[PDB]
Design a binder for this molecule. Structure first.
Ligand SMILES: O=S(=O)(Cc1ccccc1)Nc1c(F)cc(Oc2ncccc2-c2ccnc(N[C@@H]3CNC[C@@H](F)C3)n2)c(F)c1F
Length: 403
């Protein structure tokens, strides 16, 4: 019943899954650890050593599946990796999100961290999808993490090239392949941003709890060539969906040059805590406090500002807050900058507002910054884009990725 091949033992009755072409995965043991064990044809009929070596160079990162050993003795080779709780697919399909909190977001973050590690090593993955993202068993503190796996299509690029030929292997998995991998008329070679495209689809798949930007399975790939995507799950007037839409629409752009790099994605407010959101608002208002209203920065900030502040943002805050501004008023209700100014001031003087004002805002910082983003769902997304003019400044390094 149990099979043994060196330090690797496994029972063939416990099949965890498949890969393709006689690829099979069993539950097993190596050393004294719980592993999953993928069985692959020998190197004669696999040509998998180059890609196992890439797994070797990458697996140090916590969000790249840890790889333990391979053994060759039999007809086959056996690759032992860390035994995991679920694929991301199973997680999205089988698990009640009501009770999970920010956990799905952090799995997206951890996946992006792992992908940024790969790209930093000049490795492109080329086959990212929920089935390929593993979820760890709980650690001693009951925490879990996502890990990139499945290196069968990974390529290391030479140091002078930032692209590879698209005729250079299987395109990937239907439904998750960047359009430049398949499109007929395409004068530009694929790059790292095929992973960002696939990642963008995974993001929506998670936060939509199982839907896909380009439709149901049978039209996905076709809609990808046509660029007919849809993010229906993202309400256009909820702060969190607004922020998520703004990132995902960039990750899945038809133009690969418009897609954010993984390090940019890691910086996006999609991943910011409330505390970090409020701190961004404060740093912005400090930055522009003595900027000319005619200057580039403020001008950029105010374009389209009326929709963001809802014409008169003073008629869109609770009354106890309205009366606290009038004490020393003079606030323009159409100015984004003056909305941020008010926020900065009430934050800075928070330990002094009247009780009813402190209670209408909520606790500093979590409830406080939600008082505003919930009332002006476009404010942060608007401010993030406008303030890219200062992304090169030491002040704004926590918020943007720059060289
Ligand atoms: O990175 S590789 O491609 C390195 C490589 C590079 C080039 C050529 C070949 C290999 N190897 C590589 C890989 F992708 C995936 C592997 O495993 C799997 N495959 C398919 C489906 C699931 C798993 C798996 C893995 C770990 N835990 C669990 N737990 C279960 C999850 N769901 C419910 C419960 F069943 C518990 N399921 C695997 F074992 C590998 F070795």
């Amino acid at each position: 019943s149990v099979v043994i091949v060196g330090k690797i033992s496994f029972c063939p009755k416990d099949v965890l899954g498949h890969g393709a072409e006689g690829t099979i995965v069993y539950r097993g043991m190596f050393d004294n650890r719980d592993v999953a064990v993928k069985r692959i044809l020998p190197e004669c009929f696999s040509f998998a050593d180059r890609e196992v070596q890439l797994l070797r160079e990458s697996d140090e990162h916590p969000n790249v599946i840890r790889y333990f050993c391979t053994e060759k003795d039999r007809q086959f080779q056996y690759i032992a990796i860390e035994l995991c709780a679920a694929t991301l697919q199973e997680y999205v399909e089988q698990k009640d999100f009501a009770h999970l909190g920010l956990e799905p977001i952090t799995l997206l973050q951890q996946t992006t961290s792992g992908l940024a590690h790969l790209h930093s090593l000049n490795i492109v993955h080329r086959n990212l999808k929920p089935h390929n993202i593993l979820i760890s068993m709980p650690n001693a503190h009951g925490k879990i993490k996502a890990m990139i796996s499945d290196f069968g299509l990974c390529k290391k690029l030479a140091v002078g090239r930032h692209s590879f030929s698209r005729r250079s292997g299987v395109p990937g998995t239907e439904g998750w392949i960047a359009p430049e991998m398949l499109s007929e008329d395409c004068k530009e070679n694929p790059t790292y941003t095929v992973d960002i495209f696939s990642a963008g689809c995974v993001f929506y798949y998670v936060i939509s709890e199982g839907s896909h930007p380009f439709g149901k399975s049978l039209q996905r790939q076709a809609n990808i060539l046509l660029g007919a995507c849809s993010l229906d799950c993202l309400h256009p007037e909820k702060h969190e969906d607004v922020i998520a839409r703004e990132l995902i629409e960039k990750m899945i752009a038809m133009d690969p040059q418009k897609r954010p790099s993984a390090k940019h994605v890691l910086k996006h407010p999609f991943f910011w805590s409330l505390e970090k959101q409020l701190q961004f608002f404060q740093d912005v208002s400090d930055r522009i406090e003595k900027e000319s209203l005619d200057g580039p920065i403020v001008k950029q900030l105010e374009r389209g500002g009326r929709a963001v502040v809802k014409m008169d943002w003073r008629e869109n805050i609770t009354v106890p807050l309205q009366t606290d501004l009038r004490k020393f008023r003079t606030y323009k209700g159409g100015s984004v900058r003056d909305l941020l100014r008010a926020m900065r001031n009430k934050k800075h003087h928070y330990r002094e507002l009247p009780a009813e004002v402190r209670e209408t805002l909520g606790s500093l910082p979590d409830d406080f910054v939600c008082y505003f983003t919930s009332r002006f769902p476009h404010l942060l997304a608007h401010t993030y884009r406008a303030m890219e003019l200062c992304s090169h400044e030491r002040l704004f390094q926590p918020y943007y990725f720059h060289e």
